[PDB]
Amino acid sequence: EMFPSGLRVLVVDDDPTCLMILERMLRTCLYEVTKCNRAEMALSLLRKNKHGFDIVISDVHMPDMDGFKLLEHVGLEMDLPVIMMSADDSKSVVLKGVTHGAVDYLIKPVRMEALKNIWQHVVRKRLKKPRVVWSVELHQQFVAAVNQLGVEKAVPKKILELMNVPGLTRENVASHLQKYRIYLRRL
Amino acid sequence: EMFPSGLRVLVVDDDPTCLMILERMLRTCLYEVTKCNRAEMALSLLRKNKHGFDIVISDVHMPDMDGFKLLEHVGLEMDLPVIMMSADDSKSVVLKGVTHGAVDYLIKPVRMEALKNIWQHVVRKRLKKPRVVWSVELHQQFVAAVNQLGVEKAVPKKILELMNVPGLTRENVASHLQKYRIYLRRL
Numbered sequence A, B: 001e002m003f004p005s006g007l008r009v010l011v012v013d014d015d016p017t018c019l020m021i022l023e024r025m026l027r028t029c030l031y032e033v034t035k036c037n038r039a040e041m042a043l044s045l046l047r048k049n050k051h052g053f054d055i056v057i058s059d060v061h062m063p064d065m066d067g068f069k070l071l072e073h074v075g076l077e078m079d080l081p082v083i084m085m086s087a088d089d090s091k092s093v094v095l096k097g098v099t100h101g102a103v104d105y106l107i108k109p110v111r112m113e114a115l116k117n118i119w120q121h122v123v124r125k126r127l128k129k130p131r132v133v134w135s136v137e138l139h140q141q142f143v144a145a146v147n148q149l150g151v152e153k154a155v156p157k158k159i160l161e162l163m164n165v166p167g168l169t170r171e172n173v174a175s176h177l178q179k180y181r182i183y184l185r186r187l
Helices: A016-028 A039-048 A067-077 A091-099 A112-121 A136-149 A156-163 A170-186 B016-028 B039-048 B067-077 B091-099 B112-121 B136-149 B156-163 B170-186
Strands: A008-012 A032-036 A055-059 A082-086 A104-107 A131-133 B008-012 B032-036 B055-059 B082-086 B104-107 B131-133
Touching: A008 A016, A008 A039, A016 A032, A016 A112, A032 A039, A039 A055, A039 A067, A039 B039, A055 A067, A055 A112, A067 A082, A067 A091, A067 A136, A082 A091, A091 A104, A091 A136, A091 A170, A104 A112, A104 A170, A136 A156, A136 A170, A156 A170, B008 B016, B008 B039, B016 B032, B016 B112, B032 B039, B039 B055, B039 B067, B055 B067, B055 B112, B067 B082, B067 B091, B067 B136, B082 B091, B091 B104, B091 B136, B091 B170, B104 B112, B104 B170, B136 B156, B136 B170, B156 B170
Parallel strands: A008 A032, A008 A055, A055 A082, A082 A104, B008 B032, B008 B055, B055 B082, B082 B104
Antiparallel strands: A131 B131
16 A cells, blocks of 8 residues: 655654654664753744744643643644644543634654654645634634534535634635544544 | 823843843833843743733844744744844834734834834733734735725725735735724825
8 A cells, every 4th residue: 555755844842752753763764863851942843934833742841831822832733733642531532622713633652653644634646825824712612513413414505504603604614624634534 | 081001011132232222212112121142032032921912022143043033933833022133224124024923113323202102013002712823925915905995095905905815805905904004104
């Protein structure tokens, strides 16, 4: 089966053991890895080179910033795939990862198969217009709406009815659902 | 005539004399001023609190980043009003300020009237949808198109014809033109 070697991953964690594990497993899986232990530094590294990182993995806890708001900055503001690394697997923490913008999550202890499969949010087998940026408030309304209808039955028109946001289009919701589908199915 | 006192301005300059002048004049004009001497730090200060700064003034030259790309980060990526502070007033530098995302510019020496009038890009006398973010490449095509048609005659349909970007709408161009109208008229 197909495997995309050489994707570039930024791993953000103030825990050196967690960082070492993630880096070693990603290199075993042929990803290219950049490590960083501060949220502010991660954000600077991502702006420094847009079209430089394919996916970010960041710890739910960070020493210089609330970890969930880093998820918002990376996953929503910058529209990058961000994966939440958490030691806590309660329903509330897992729900908060996706409500703050992550496309997926990893629970300690991280299994190789789970870690290796993160490329699914980046590549697929088969000058452009302005990109649309979702606010955290809008995103949380979307997650609530989709969870109410059921992820398998939620169609753009029904999501829109529940969100009740003038100007929000069917296309906007469909492309947002495609980005967050995998996480929402895990719920 | 109406004057909006108390707007919050971030001034970004590694030249302490320039920073002191801008801060003193802005405080005389009743703005609230935050100073910062590094591009990276400016960017962190702006994310730290969105809905915190009303307008940014940044020097065309910065020691830790190309000044024009800071304009892109602030004016286009973050969609804040950024004003280019420059000692150079050549046609090429002035054109580059607006092609990299600034809504206006200030030339040394800065006159009080010019400095005091920066509120025009922020306020006016009379949960929402995703915001649209322009890439620098798209923005530069837009500036070229508008300059070809003439800023006073440029209507969205004609701008679109010249830009030739599938998916770019009339509404997108009209709201972009409204943001950059003042600078483009100065050209």
